[PDB]
Design a protein around this ligand. Structure first.
Ligand SMILES: CCC(CC)CN(C[C@@H](O)[C@H](Cc1ccccc1)NC(=O)O[C@H]1CO[C@H]2OCC[C@H]21)S(=O)(=O)c1ccc([C@H](C)O)cc1
Lengths: 99, 99
């Protein structure tokens, strides 16, 4: 679809078999989700945001569906204030900005 | 133009008579700029993201030009690591997400 920006660009995602709400975030390199259980192995990693750096769990090659578009990529799990879909997955679903 | 998301969506802006590079950030409600000594009234604010909060100064009715498109609105100024164009100004320049 075409998504205007007068409201937050929230979408329903499917991951680990559960539905969630997440923000399409072109200012995020990476996809970061609030604390949750995910199957598979993970490695500890750090990521930085506007306020500093946090510890996250890095899950690689995770299946995630975003508005019915499929992506398979890295999902970071940790104390983000909001579930965000970053460019690593936005590129997989063909997302561009246009003006 | 059409901006793909393989790399950060960085564009040149003009604000307070200065040129800067900034992120077109659909994940930001409002616009946050690197510390700069703008004239006029302001009010202090705290804004939060990954890693916590930073203190900013909120200026209202600021003119920013984004890739030749003029916009005027609220800008927050403080120690952000990157200039961030948020939805308050992205709407004004006709910017949409498309996939
Ligand atoms: C989860 C945060 C979202 C949702 C609440 C909001 N943020 C925008 C988001 O796009 C940031 C933009 C950013 C910040 C620092 C360095 C680079 C890019 N990206 C980001 O944290 O991405 C992480 C993930 O991937 C990694 O790449 C980049 C850094 C890593 S914000 O900046 O905190 C913010 C908060 C309040 C306002 C006003 C008050 O509305 C305006 C902007």
């Amino acid at each position: 679809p075409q998504i205007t920006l007068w409201k937050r660009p929230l979408v329903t995602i499917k991951i680990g078999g559960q539905l969630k709400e997440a923000l399409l975030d072109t200012g995020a390199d990476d996809t970061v989700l609030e604390e949750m259980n995910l199957p598979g192995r993970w490695k500890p990693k750090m990521i930085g945001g506007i306020g500093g750096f946090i510890k996250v769990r890095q899950y690689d090659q995770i299946l995630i569906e975003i508005c019915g578009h499929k992506a398979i990529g890295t999902v970071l799990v940790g104390p983000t204030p909001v579930n965000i879909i970053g460019r690593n997955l936005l590129t997989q679903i063909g997302c561009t900005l246009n003006f």
